[PDB]
Design a protein around this ligand. Sequence first.
Ligand SMILES: Cc1cc2nc3c(=O)[nH]c(=O)nc-3n(C[C@H](O)[C@H](O)[C@H](O)COP(=O)(O)OP(=O)(O)OC[C@H]3O[C@@H](n4cnc5c(N)ncnc54)[C@H](O)[C@@H]3O)c2cc1C
Length: 370
Amino acid sequence: KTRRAEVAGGGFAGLTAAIALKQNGWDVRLHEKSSELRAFGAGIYLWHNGLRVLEGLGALDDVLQGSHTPPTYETWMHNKSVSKETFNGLPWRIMTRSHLHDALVNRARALGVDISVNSEAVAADPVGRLTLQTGEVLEADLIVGADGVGSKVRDSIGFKQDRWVSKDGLIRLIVPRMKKELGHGEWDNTIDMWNFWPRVQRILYSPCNENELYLGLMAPAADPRGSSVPIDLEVWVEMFPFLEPCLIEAAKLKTARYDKYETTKLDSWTRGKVALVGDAAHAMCPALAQGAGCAMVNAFSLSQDLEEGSSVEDALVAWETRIRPITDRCQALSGDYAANRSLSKGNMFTPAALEAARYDPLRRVYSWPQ
Ligand SMILES: Cc1cc2nc3c(=O)[nH]c(=O)nc-3n(C[C@H](O)[C@H](O)[C@H](O)COP(=O)(O)OP(=O)(O)OC[C@H]3O[C@@H](n4cnc5c(N)ncnc54)[C@H](O)[C@@H]3O)c2cc1C
């Protein structure tokens, strides 16, 4: 009589879905294809919307402890400060990916979510079957495709898909803060350091806590030095000399990767008893820092709609209808910002830009008015 859910993917979306369902009394199994549970991407920003999901997951305290809210979100163009934004009190937070992942994993385990590593979903059936790489077929009342941008769950079913790949990427790293070595300045701030001259090179500077700094080093794919990993120390120091102590530490990271990314928009997110959440459904440009925030809101919202006393099929349809427009709008605006390099101007976290962030999934209203 206990409802059964199978979740494919052990990322932020899958873990969120698993915790939220388990909290509602579902028997939940989560499948992670990797040998271990781990989050990549170095660091991550969350906002009010994602912090509220964490609150609703009972995972907020572990996240806030050991993460950071900068005094301000500052933007530079060619080393000149062009804006400082604090979003009228809107809560936000920076942390390492592992920090967020660990909080979600610990909460999942505390609740008795069944987690299988080395377990890869290769197909899903709308009537409620999930097939693993081994050949094993699992039956369930709900199947969640939270398996990222190349979702086999999605592709095993076939969803009409708008796909785009970014030509340019970036290198994301965690390094020591080296705060004392940085000297005079406001080194607790987020600082988005844009340049187009003498070359296109940008650093998003993002403190995660008193010990760890998240750096995003962005240069065109066509730049053989700026895009190099391990980093070409000289060309980063040249344009960002005030960050030399941290860049010296970054140069030690021989695991650095130049990551490109893609965006995804689907004609829908559901088929029968199958729901797609996270990047598998709606991967977006990083400009508004809402990829995971939207993913978490969506996975959390899915659990909510499954409490209405409907069939799973109808609840899934109602879920997309209810919650998707917030993601569609955020994805679109983020895409525009990215295409137009809008963030380079500063002062671009407008009310419309902050729309996803303002959404409270717990009370289902918009908060922190701008
Ligand atoms: C450069 C960059 C910066 C970003 N910055 C932010 C930010 O600051 N704030 C924010 O909110 N978002 C940010 N995002 C977006 C955010 O990273 C993603 O939206 C988020 O990680 C999506 O999580 P997910 O669980 O949907 O997918 P993923 O994180 O891709 O996780 C899926 C998990 O899938 C497991 N898996 C894959 N295939 C299978 C399978 N077949 N079977 C079982 N398991 C499988 C994967 O191995 C992994 O464990 C950023 C994105 C990029 C590219």
